[PDB]
């Protein structure tokens, strides 16, 4: 008989430091941790796209009721949740003609096609930023379906990448999402039906817009102080790999600071997904210096986690650049071995947060399960748990589980209950997808607002 320990849900801080377990409830009830004065929109689309965007903004002004209000919380309205104003009449609209898109699409070179499609939008964005005195906080790109389907060296990745040197928060919204009712797959019904999940769509879009405009919808507090939760992701370039790091830590005021820690670390090696000692030493020196400048003193622990296992050489380099009094914990999180738990009598999956301890150096954690708070399980099918292995260093296998579960609750790109994989890894993955989509940057911005 195998015993499953349980890890309880962590609490995320909201306005006035009040705690809750669901962003969709904590925000609607309490309000964001930091409030902004308002959001100046910026739209780069057609007249059709501008009309759609204004319609959607005014629609989310009013409360949004989704079909199953009990399982997924309703949307009070943008100003009702966040406390700032987001009007559809303050749009600094920059028109894009379908004809110039058409002449771009007719070019033989696909790489030049996607480069020119990115260039159109980004150059219009740059022109407005440098010419229009109207301050724009977030630029919302209402792209048509032709861009999405004809152009497939990715539109989104390059577009986010080529704006990094100018530091402009952007939000791509395909017109299929905003006008889903009038986008039908010739059957007479929408291509993807948002009817029962309209409120959750409003939640996600509004949260993404609020975050990118300088607001912090919620912050974490249920993590150990003095620890720099650091995540690495490796991305393929074809025979080079590209490491990207994201770091989360508590400050002097006990406020979680979540920021990227990315520097170029390119390794070309037969043995892939490993770092040379120089790259690793750079990596760790950058992270430690960032913690030092944010808090003064050095961390009491460097909780390095990744989807891969570390070899000896890079760990020795890590230890060599590490000062004294600081411990290093290298944790590998894998989601490949199928351990599907079926409940004996019933029809709803295992509760989220259950944890199976293999031994002192490994565990299974069900970061995806059935959450009673929303009554809606995060997985349609049986949820595969994440295998958390303490690859290197000394740690408590339950403490690592609770730390990972806490790190699974800071996805600002979506206002879901919690993320299946820890957020630092997923955001580092997004950074790697973007930072490797254009030319090398001397100093990429360390704020996710520009990436997600």
């Amino acid at each position: 008989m195998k015993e499953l320990i349980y890890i309880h849900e962590p609490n995320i801080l909201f306005a006035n430091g009040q705690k809750c377990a669901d962003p969709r409830d904590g925000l609607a009830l309490f309000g964001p941790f930091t409030k902004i004065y308002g959001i100046k929109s910026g739209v780069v689309g057609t007249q059709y796209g501008l009309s759609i965007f204004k319609n959607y903004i005014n629609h989310i002004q009013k409360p949004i009721y989704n079909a199953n209000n009990i399982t997924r919380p309703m949307f009070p309205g943008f100003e009702a949740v966040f406390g700032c104003k987001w009007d559809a009449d303050n749009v600094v609209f920059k028109e894009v003609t379908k004809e110039e898109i058409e002449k771009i699409l007719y070019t033989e070179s696909n790489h030049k096609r996607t480069y020119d499609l990115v260039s159109l939008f980004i150059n219009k964005i740059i022109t407005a930023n440098k010419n229009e005195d109207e301050k724009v906080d977030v630029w919302f790109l209402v792209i048509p379906d032709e861009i999405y389907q004809y152009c497939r060296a990715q539109f989104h990745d390059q577009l986010k990448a080529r704006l990094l040197e100018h530091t402009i928060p952007t939000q791509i919204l395909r017109e299929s999402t905003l006008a889903w009712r009038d986008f039908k797959n010739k059957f007479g019904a929408p291509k993807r039906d948002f009817s029962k999940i309209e409120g959750h769509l409003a939640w996600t879009i509004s949260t993404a817009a609020f975050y990118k405009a300088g607001g912090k919808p919620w912050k974490l507090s249920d993590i150990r102080s003095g620890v720099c939760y650091l995540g690495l992701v490796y991305k393929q370039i074809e025979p080079k790999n590209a490491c990207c790091a994201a770091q989360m830590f508590l400050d002097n005021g006990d406020g979680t600071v979540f920021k990227g820690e990315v520097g170029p670390w390119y390794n070309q090696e037969k043995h892939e997904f490993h770092l040379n000692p120089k790259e690793a030493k750079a990596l760790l020196t950058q992270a430690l210096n960032s913690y030092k400048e944010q808090n003064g003193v050095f961390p009491k622990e460097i909780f390095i986690h990744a989807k891969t296992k570390f070899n000896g050489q890079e760990w020795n380099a890590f230890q060599e650049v590490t000062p004294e009094g600081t411990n290093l914990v290298g944790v590998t999180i894998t989601k490949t071995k199928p351990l599907k738990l079926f409940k004996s009598e019933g029809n709803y999956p295992i509760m989220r947060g259950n944890a199976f301890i293999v031994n002192e150096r490994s565990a299974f954690l069900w970061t995806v399960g059935y959450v009673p708070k929303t009554e809606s399980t995060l997985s349609m099918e049986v949820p595969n748990p994440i295998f958390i292995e303490i690859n290197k260093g000394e740690a408590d296998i339950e403490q690592v589980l609770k730390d990972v579960l806490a790190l699974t609750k800071l996805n600002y790109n979506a206002c879901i209950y919690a993320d299946g994989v820890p957020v630092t890894l997923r955001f580092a993955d997004k950074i790697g997808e973007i930072l490797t989509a254009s030319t090398e940057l001397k100093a990429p911005p360390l704020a996710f607002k520009y990436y997600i």
């Binding site: 015993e3 499953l4 409940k343």
Partner: protein, 412 residues
């Protein structure tokens, strides 16, 4: 004294608005009395003695609700005795309610507009409350926190009863007590595949590692008759299972690797005699039932082969045996599709698309029952099934998966 703000509304529909507003007002230090937040005698009592304001969540149904108009009727009465014209405050929320269908007891009054956005309406409501000098306590998040949890943050509660979870791990009941390293390097003809032997065997170094004995390989491996059965290295498996065995000839890691390879090959071989039809995956081996092999194409009162539109879906499994944490046979569920139940559709995209749609129908219990019934078919004896690795050497697999018990449950 009367220091409470009564909130009236339709019971099954206006819950969302009133819940937000009541919690919003409570968070600001007010004392709110809502039926959802908190019998007719009681309702009247508050409106008659406890209530200081009567906020009417007005909508196209709250004015057609017989029980609400009664609360309005008593509210009209109480308003007179208090000599307060500003007692009933008609919060209009419904979009289509436009000041022409209002009930006569509220039409003479000016509403607070919530039709265009709730935030300005709450801004309007608070303005009216202060204009009318309604007293309010400090918005302490303590007693107010209690109401918040009693409403939602107590619901977060996790039922603390014990549940039983059926996984997909099938432990290996038994292994042969000894691992043998035979020598047929001089007896192995060039170009012969070790995979074609009747029993599982792996060619490690200048040897042949298998769980069978020397003479077990005679037809497949020629000249083994002349071979001295003393040309073999013996290794207690339990020693390697504990990791104790680590000689310069072979390490514990490599020996366990060879054990896993033997396990997988033995599973593949037994499936050939078990009469299951094989479908190749990208990096694993799937097994499913040809239509008609089962009685009525179902077993243990659980359908394992069925029909989806023009295609036939076949429940399938793939096995990979692991020694960590402990020796088990990890089984994975799959769905395979055939045209007329005979031959497999040769389009991977079509197979994937058919499965993605078929997956919607099946549930937790549906997958568990199908997996357990499909495994129980493998059973040779009452409570297990054996995998052949030698002439007299068997490995026993529990036909039931490992049970996992948890201290936590939900309402279900």
């Amino acid at each position: 004294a009367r220091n409470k703000i009564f909130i009236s509304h339709a019971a099954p529909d206006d819950n969302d608005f009133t819940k937000w507003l009541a919690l919003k007002l409570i968070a600001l230090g007010y004392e709110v009395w809502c039926d959802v937040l908190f019998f007719w005698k009681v309702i009247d009592k508050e409106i008659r003695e406890g209530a200081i304001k009567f906020l009417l969540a007005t909508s196209e149904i709250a004015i057609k609700r017989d029980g609400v108009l009664k609360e309005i009727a008593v509210a009209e009465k109480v308003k007179k005795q208090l000599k307060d014209d500003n007692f009933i405050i008609p919060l209009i929320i419904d979009e289509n309610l436009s000041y022409d269908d209002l009930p006569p007891e509220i039409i003479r009054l000016n509403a607070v507009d919530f039709k265009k956005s709730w935030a300005v309406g709450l801004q309007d409501l608070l303005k009216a409350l202060d204009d009318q000098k309604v007293e309010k306590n400090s918005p302490d998040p303590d007693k107010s926190n209690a109401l918040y949890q009693q409403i939602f943050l107590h619901n977060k509660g996790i039922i603390e009863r014990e549940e039983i979870y059926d996984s997909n791990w099938f432990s290996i009941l038994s292994f042969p007590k000894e691992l043998r390293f035979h020598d047929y390097e001089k007896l192995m003809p060039k170009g012969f595949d070790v995979r074609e032997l009747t029993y599982p065997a792996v060619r490690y170094k200048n040897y042949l590692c298998t769980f069978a004995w020397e003479y077990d390989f005679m037809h497949q491996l020629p000249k083994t008759e002349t071979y001295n059965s003393s040309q073999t290295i013996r290794i207690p498996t339990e020693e390697i299972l504990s990791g104790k065995y680590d000689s310069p000839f072979i390490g514990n890691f490599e020996c366990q690797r060879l054990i896993v390879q033997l396990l997988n090959k033995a599973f593949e071989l037994r499936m050939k005699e078990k009469g299951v039809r094989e479908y190749p995956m990208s990096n694993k081996m799937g097994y499913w039932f040809e239509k008609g092999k089962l009685e009525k194409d179902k077993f243990n009162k659980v359908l394992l082969v069925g029909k989806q539109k023009d295609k036939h879906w076949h429940f399938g499994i793939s096995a990979a045996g692991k020694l960590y944490p402990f020796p088990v046979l990890m089984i994975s569920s799959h769905i395979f599709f055939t045209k007329d139940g005979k031959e497999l559709i040769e389009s991977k995209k079509i197979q994937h698309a058919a499965r993605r749609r078929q997956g919607k129908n099946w549930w937790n219990d549906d997958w568990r029952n199908k997996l357990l019934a499909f495994v129980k078919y493998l059973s040779d004896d009452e409570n297990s099934f054996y995998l052949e690795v030698g002439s007299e050497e068997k490995i026993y697999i529990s036909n039931e998966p490992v049970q996992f018990v948890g201290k936590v449950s939900y309402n279900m």
